[PDB]
Amino acid sequence: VNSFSGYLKLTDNVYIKNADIVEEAKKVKPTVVVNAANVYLKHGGGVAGALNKATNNAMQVESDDYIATNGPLKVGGSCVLSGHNLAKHCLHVVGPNVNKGEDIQLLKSAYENFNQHEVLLAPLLSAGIFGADPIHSLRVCVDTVRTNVYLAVFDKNLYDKLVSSFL
Numbered sequence: 001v002n003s004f005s006g007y008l009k010l011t012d013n014v015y016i017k018n019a020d021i022v023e024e025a026k027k028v029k030p031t032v033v034v035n036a037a038n039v040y041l042k043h044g045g046g047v048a049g050a051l052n053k054a055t056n057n058a059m060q061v062e063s064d065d066y067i068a069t070n071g072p073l074k075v076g077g078s079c080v081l082s083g084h085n086l087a088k089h090c091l092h093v094v095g096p097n098v099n100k101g102e103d104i105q106l107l108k109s110a111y112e113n114f115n116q117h118e119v120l121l122a123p124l125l126s127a128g129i130f131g132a133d134p135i136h137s138l139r140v141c142v143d144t145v146r147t148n149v150y151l152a153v154f155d156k157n158l159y160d161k162l163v164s165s166f167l
């Protein structure tokens with residue numbers, strides 16, 4: 001039993017809710033919240049900008065030190081950093097950004113990072129400002145992630161479409 005509430009069960013291991021991931025993290029304080037990161041960990045907008053704003057920019061400060069030491073992530077890759085006031089840990093995962101021309105096949109590799117964590121609160125990778133089709137992202141999630149994932153979808157309209165079209 002875990003503390004996630006109000007989710008619709010899609011499969012054995014994937015759950016979904018219309019929610020603001022920032023508010024959801026603040027309430028649940030999950031072990032892992034996933035950030036929709038870019039390779040530079042520049043958390044300017046979308047999910048990343050909202051998560052970082054909720055940490056009062058501490059996420060960005062920590063991220064800048066990470067990049068200065070380690071260099072950029074790979075598209076499809078990830079790193080574990082602090083969850084600050086939102087979670088124990090933040091798993092920064094880089095999905096392909098269609099608005100940069102990145103290969104959508106890398107979306108499966110991005111979701112594979114979730115399998116290193118037993119339970120996660122996460123957004124749909126490559127959705128929103130990353131330009132992928134969220135219905136496709138949900139399908140890849142279900143077909144790739146084997147650990148327990150609680151998906152927060154900010155937009156109510158999109159949430160209803162994702163549920164209604166789910167196979």
Ligand SMILES: Cc1oc(CNc2ncnc3[nH]c4ccccc4c23)cc1C(=O)O
Binds near residue numbers: 129131133134
């Ligand atoms: C996970 C997510 O993606 C988005 C923005 N992209 C889209 N939004 C609604 N319909 C959409 N059709 C599409 C067809 C092709 C590409 C993108 C969209 C798309 C907002 C959210 C959210 O979490 O609220």
